[PDB]
Amino acid sequence: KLPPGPTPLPVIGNILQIGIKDISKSLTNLSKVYGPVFTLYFGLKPIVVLHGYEAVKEALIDLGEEFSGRGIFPLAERANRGFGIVFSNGKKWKEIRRFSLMTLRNFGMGKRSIEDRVQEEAHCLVEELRKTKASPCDPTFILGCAPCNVICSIIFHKRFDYKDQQFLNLMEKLNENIKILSSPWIQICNNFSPIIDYFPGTHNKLLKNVAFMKSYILEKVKEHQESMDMNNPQDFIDCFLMKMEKEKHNQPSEFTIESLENTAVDLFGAGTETTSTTLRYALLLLLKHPEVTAKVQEEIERVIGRNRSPCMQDRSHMPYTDAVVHEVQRYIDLLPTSLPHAVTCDIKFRNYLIPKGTTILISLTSVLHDNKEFPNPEMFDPHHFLDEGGNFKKSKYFMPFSAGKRICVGEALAGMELFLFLTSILQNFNLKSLVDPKNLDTTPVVNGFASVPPFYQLCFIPI
Ligand code: HEM
Ligand SMILES: CCCCc1nc(Cl)c(CO)n1Cc1ccc(-c2ccccc2-c2nn[nH]n2)cc1
Ligand SMILES: CCCCc1nc(Cl)c(CO)n1Cc1ccc(-c2ccccc2-c2nn[nH]n2)cc1
Ligand SMILES: [K+]
Numbered sequence: 001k002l003p004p005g006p007t008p009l010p011v012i013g014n015i016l017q018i019g020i021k022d023i024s025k026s027l028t029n030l031s032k033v034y035g036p037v038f039t040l041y042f043g044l045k046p047i048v049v050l051h052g053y054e055a056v057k058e059a060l061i062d063l064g065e066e067f068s069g070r071g072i073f074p075l076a077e078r079a080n081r082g083f084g085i086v087f088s089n090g091k092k093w094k095e096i097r098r099f100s101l102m103t104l105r106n107f108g109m110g111k112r113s114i115e116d117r118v119q120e121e122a123h124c125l126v127e128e129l130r131k132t133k134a135s136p137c138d139p140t141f142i143l144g145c146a147p148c149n150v151i152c153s154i155i156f157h158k159r160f161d162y163k164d165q166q167f168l169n170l171m172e173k174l175n176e177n178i179k180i181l182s183s184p185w186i187q188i189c190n191n192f193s194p195i196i197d198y199f200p201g202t203h204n205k206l207l208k209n210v211a212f213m214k215s216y217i218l219e220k221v222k223e224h225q226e227s228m229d230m231n232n233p234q235d236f237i238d239c240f241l242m243k244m245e246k247e248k249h250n251q252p253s254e255f256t257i258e259s260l261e262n263t264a265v266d267l268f269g270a271g272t273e274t275t276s277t278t279l280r281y282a283l284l285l286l287l288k289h290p291e292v293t294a295k296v297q298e299e300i301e302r303v304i305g306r307n308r309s310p311c312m313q314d315r316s317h318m319p320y321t322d323a324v325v326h327e328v329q330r331y332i333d334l335l336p337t338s339l340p341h342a343v344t345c346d347i348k349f350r351n352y353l354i355p356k357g358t359t360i361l362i363s364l365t366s367v368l369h370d371n372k373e374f375p376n377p378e379m380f381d382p383h384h385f386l387d388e389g390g391n392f393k394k395s396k397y398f399m400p401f402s403a404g405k406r407i408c409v410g411e412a413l414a415g416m417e418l419f420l421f422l423t424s425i426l427q428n429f430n431l432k433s434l435v436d437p438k439n440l441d442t443t444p445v446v447n448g449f450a451s452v453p454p455f456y457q458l459c460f461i462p463i
Contacts, residue, residue, distance in 0.1 A: 002046055003352045005039035006030065013041025020188050022446045024336035024365045027051060031366070037350060040361075043192055047340075047359045048352075051366045053373075053397055059341075059349065060362065060404030066347045068405035071340025071359040073191040078203040079181075080210070083259060084266035085409060086339065095254040096263055100409050103239040104154070110234050117153040118416050119309050121146050122424040128162055129429060129460040136434050136457045139283055140276075145171065147275035147417055151268050154413075156220050157235030170216060170268075173209040178273045180206060184448040213268065214261045221257060236264070271410050274334055275417050281453045282328045282422055285380050287433045288442050292382060293426060296321050300427045306463075310423040312416060318423075319392040323385035325418045326392075329368075329400035331380045332444055334451050336365040338402045364399055373397040380442065425460075432459040 008014050018026040018040065030038055031051035040047045050056050059067040070087050081087040085096050106113050125146045132142075145162050148171055153159040160167035180186055180202060190199050197203060224237045233239045240260045247253035286293040299318045304310050315322055341360035346353065354360075369377040373395055374384045387393045401408035408414070433440060434457045444451035 001353065002039045002358075003037045003048055003350075003354075004034055005041075006034070008041035011043060013043050013045070015043065015192065020184055020448060023188075023449060024333075024363065024446065027337065027361065027363050028366065031363075037352060042359075043194075045194075045359065047361055048354055049361045049363065051363045053367050053370060056362055056364075056367055056399070056403065057396075059360065060402070060406075063347065063349065064404040066343055066345060067341050067360060069342030069344045069357065069360075070406070071342045071361075073340075074194055074197070075187065075191055078190075078197050079206045084262040084264075086266045086270055089342070089344075092254050092259070096259060097409065099240070099243055099255070100263065100267075103236055104409065104413060106412075109154075109236065109239050110232060112157075112234065114154065114413060115312055115416060115420075117159070118150055118413075118420050119311065121150050121153070121159060121417075122420045123309065124149070124159070124162070125421055126424050126428045129425065130462065132460055134459050134461050136459060138455070138457055139280055143279040143283070143421075144175070144272065144276040146279070146421055148174065148268070148272045150413070150417060151271045153235075155217075155236045155264050155267065157238070166216065170213060173212050174268055174272055177206055177209045178269070182447060182450055188448050210265055213265055217261050217264045218257070221260060236267070267410075270408075271413070275410075275414055277334055277452060278328060278332065278414070278418060279421055281332045281334075282325070282418070283425075283431060283458065284440070284442055284453050284456050285328055285331070286426070287431050287456070287458055288437055288440050289380065290431075290437060292324060293431060296324055296423075297426050300423055304423070304427060306427065310420050310427065312419065314423070315419050319386065319390060320382065321419070321423060322392045323382040325415075325422065326385040326395075326398060327380060327382045328418070330374065330384060330398060332451060332453070333365050333368050334400070335402075335449070336363070336446070336451060337449055338362045338364050339406075341406065362402065364402065367397050367399045370397050428463055429460040430463060432461050434458070 036052045036055040076082045149159045244255045247255050299321050303317045343354050345356050401411040
């Protein structure tokens with residue numbers, strides 16, 4: 001017997017019982033009557049919901065191999081998304097993910113470290129912010145460019161100028177697609193139609209945008225094919241190609257030019273928007289709490305000077321800064337239900353039989369906003385990650401990147417972008433609101449399965 005739940009209506013299951021505006025809050029309300037493990041029917045499709053640390057840990061960590069499937073909805077097929085890492089399953093996922101973790105290690109692709117690629121980008125970000133000449137600024141475009149250029153330097157071994165036309169084109173297609181993918185019509189309502197696609201023009205537009213990106217990625221693998229130094233892989237493409245060489249006597253291989261294009265598209269997708277949004281949010285929270293910004297700056301000035309770039313080594317000597325970055329991710333909760341999981345086999349889970357391929361929804365909100373681990377969890381307070389002495393207090397409830405076998409591939413890279421972009425910004429600038437700080441609102445704006453910050457402007461005032 002599946003876990004207990006609200007009795008489904010015929011055909012529509014429990015769809016009339018969930019506010020699709022704020023799915024996270026509905027899931028939380030259902031946990032107060034059905035407890036931490038409960039079943040919802042998305043039109044005869046059973047979804048099991050895990051709410052709370054204990055259930056999420058039990059599934060994602062204790063039974064990690066069983067809860068490592070990606071949940072599949074019609075959008076996976078309509079947008080052709082199951083051929084990289086994010087939406088792939090089985091052998092294809094296991095192999096592309098294991099290759100991807102190895103290649104994304106700090107020194108995973110040659111002498112030039114990931115850290116060096118981000119440090120370079122952090123310098124360019126600081127230069128673009130100077131060019132705003134301390135005038136009112138929606139930082140959305142600029143903060144979106146930085147993480148996107150890090151992905152570019154990781155994949156193609158060289159970053160673009162922010163004014164370069166091929167870059168603005170890629171950036172434009174990525175943003176359109178992310179904005180389309182974020183509509184409840186595309187991510188929820190059209191998924192209720194298992195066979196008929198009610199938005200065929202939208203899916204076409206998504207697939208044209210991907211094609212454009214895939215075409216640029218192919219132009220570059222050609223350029224990498226001719227200038228190939230075995231004994232010197234520079235980037236994700238060099239490492240992927242020479243993985244293909246080692247796979248030449250073992251076809252059919254999960255490593256092909258097709259799976260490189262699709263993997264690259266996933267890294268652009270996964271690695272841009274969430275980092276971008278987290279940065280934009282961090283600046284809003286620093287605007288709203290200027291004392292916090294001032295203590296970060298004190299750590300910056302004391303531990304780092306004004307004569308050198310920040311570097312990751314500084315983070316262990318900057319507990320307050322580390323607490324702030326950790327409290328930004330915890331407070332804003334950008335992926336309140338992560339991405340859906342699926343069980344990879346039949347599994348007994350607290351005396352509930354969950355059949356192979358049943359969709360699992362993880363409430364990361366329920367962990368990040370635990371009111372016992374983080375007292376007053378709806379408040380931004382760096383003290384949630386500090387002890388009485390001022391040292392960094394780690395939390396097992398810190399899961400903005402999810403947990404277990406599907407944990408975000410970019411966990412380490414995101415951690416570096418956030419630490420280095422934010423320390424580089426505050427080492428070179430003070431932040432000025434156009435509205436009085438006490439007025440600005442910082443509560444997440446939820447639209448289905450994602451949180452975004454409110455609109456805001458600020459001035460980057462050189463130090
Ligand atoms: C603050 C930034 C980020 C956050 C909060 C974040 C969070 C997440 C979460 C919650 C997942 C879903 C894990 C699950 O399936 O349960 C995910 C997946 C993933 N993230 Fe990130 N992510 C971020 C940045 C990045 C970056 C920079 C990359 C760059 C490589 C990346 C690559 C991926 C990939 C490939 C997956 C799919 C992993 C898989 O299905 O096996 N992410 N991320
Ligand atoms: C029919 C194949 C055309 C695909 C396509 N490529 C691009 Cl580029 C455009 C720009 O609109 N488009 C067309 C397009 C037309 C309507 C939508 C749309 C916008 C808002 C609400 C619903 C739709 C929709 N999609 N399918 N039917 N209606 C999206 C893309
Ligand atoms: C020019 C191409 C732009 C990016 C994009 N458009 C399409 Cl369509 C794909 C296939 O999913 N992609 C790649 C894609 C891969 C993973 C995601 C994903 C990663 C982590 C957390 C949430 C997202 C997500 N999925 N859907 N919307 N946002 C988003 C986009
Ligand atoms: K149409």
